[PDB]
Design a protein around this ligand. Sequence first.
Ligand SMILES: *S(O)(O)Oc1cc(-c2ccc(C(=O)N(Cc3ccccn3)c3ccc(N4CCNCC4)cc3)o2)ccc1Cl
Length: 281
Amino acid sequence: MVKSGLQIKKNAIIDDYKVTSQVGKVLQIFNKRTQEKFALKMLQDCPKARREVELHWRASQCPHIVRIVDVYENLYAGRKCLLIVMECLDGGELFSRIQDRGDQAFTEREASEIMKSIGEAIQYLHSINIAHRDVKPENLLYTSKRPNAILKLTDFGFAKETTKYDKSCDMWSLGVIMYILLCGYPPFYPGMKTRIRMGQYEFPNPEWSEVSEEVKMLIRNLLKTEPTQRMTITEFMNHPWIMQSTKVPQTPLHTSRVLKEDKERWEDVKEEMTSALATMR
Ligand SMILES: *S(O)(O)Oc1cc(-c2ccc(C(=O)N(Cc3ccccn3)c3ccc(N4CCNCC4)cc3)o2)ccc1Cl
């Protein structure tokens, strides 16, 4: 129940890690004692930088959040820097994995399982009254390239402590990610297909025809316009579909085929989500 506080080391990082002065693109480095590989984490020391690291430190323990190993305050070309050491995440981004399946065969069940992984992260946070506020594709990365790897949430660069409705956009993000997992495109309104005509019903049939109302209902609750009426993390993780993924139909989703078809738009998807987030926060 009692966890230790953040200790930012002051001593030069290269006493501890092989870096080789090739040193915010993220770098692979090596612990000298253990010779293990890690990632790093280079920020501009600033009040804000510190609050995020703090918040991230309070969450590192969560199995579905990228762990901080060590933090250094060092001078890089006489710029005060936070160097943040974290475990390597070589698995890539959640949706890239899905898109690159050779057979292109993703199931409702797999979607359920993923969403539980992500839910867990958000539950850890929300219950210690932190809000992530930047839950999107680029921030969901896998440990290893392997089939049985683990999902970790990243970028605490919009986190903050939440004495309520700040948590709401974490849930709106859940809504969006869930929806994309289920069909391959976001629930947002040349050369390619239009997936959701403007103003039309939120679950188009080509890809949503075999998804149950139960699951459409869960999604409508996460995307609820009014935060006063949007699903909470407690409600989410208590929902049957999340709670019991093993009983979730292995419904063949269109997701992997669509992400491949609409690959040119992915930058655009991510940008529309990022824009949207800045108005929702
Ligand atoms: S920050 O707090 O923003 O969180 C964060 C963490 C990572 C992160 C942790 C571990 C890794 C990692 O090891 N790799 C692999 C790698 C490969 C080559 C050189 C260095 N590292 C990794 C994974 C993913 C990414 N990015 C690239 C930019 N788009 C998103 C994925 C870089 C490095 O990374 C990464 C990013 C963030 Cl924000």
